[PDB]
Amino acid sequence: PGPEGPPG
Amino acid sequence: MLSVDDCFGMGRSAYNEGDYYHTVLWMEQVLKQLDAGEEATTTKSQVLDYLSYAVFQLGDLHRALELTRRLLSLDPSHERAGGNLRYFEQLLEE
């Protein structure tokens, strides 16, 4: 893993 | 119709509710209106950050890779995007 998106 | 920044805020609202499908709908509209030269505070790179993750959640693998590449092209010191790109290139071997 693994992609991480915007926190908020 | 809504303004670019209103649509962006709609897309961020959906993302924060965990609604990735509606994130894609709103953020695709934002990109469309930005390509129409409409004035806006939001940048393309910010839109691509939400969109690339949302399309990955929906199962759209090579599109998420394409959008992550585009994001990094416009924001090269974005470390999280660089990490996402490495994940997708290893996963898709591309």
Side-chain angles (χ1 to χ4, degrees), chain B residues 26-81:
Chain B
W26 287 114
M27 300 305 192
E28 298 273 27
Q29 182 60 216
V30 175
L31 292 177
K32 175 168 192 169
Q33 295 178 18
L34 288 171
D35 295 352
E38 304 199 5
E39 291 165 81
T41 315
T42 313
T43 65
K44 255 186 279 196
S45 69
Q46 292 177 274
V47 182
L48 292 168
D49 202 350
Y50 289 96
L51 182 59
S52 63
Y53 186 75
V55 300
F56 174 72
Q57 287 297 305
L58 294 169
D60 207 7
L61 289 179
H62 278 78
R63 181 65 171 164
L65 171 58
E66 179 184 5
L67 297 173
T68 298
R69 276 174 180 156
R70 195 176 301 163
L71 171 57
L72 195 69
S73 82
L74 299 179
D75 199 4
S77 309
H78 189 331
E79 269 189 5
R80 180 162 56 68

Side-chain angles (χ1 to χ4, degrees), chain A, chain B residues 12 15-16 50 53 56 80 84:
Chain A
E4 190 187 340
Chain B
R12 204 152 50 79
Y15 179 85
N16 288 336
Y50 289 96
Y53 186 75
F56 174 72
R80 180 162 56 68
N84 293 353

Side-chain angles (χ1 to χ4, degrees), chain B residues 6-25:
Chain B
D6 296 337
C7 285
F8 182 68
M10 294 289 181
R12 204 152 50 79
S13 175
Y15 179 85
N16 288 336
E17 303 294 334
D19 184 347
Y20 299 121
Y21 178 62
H22 285 119
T23 299
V24 173
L25 286 185

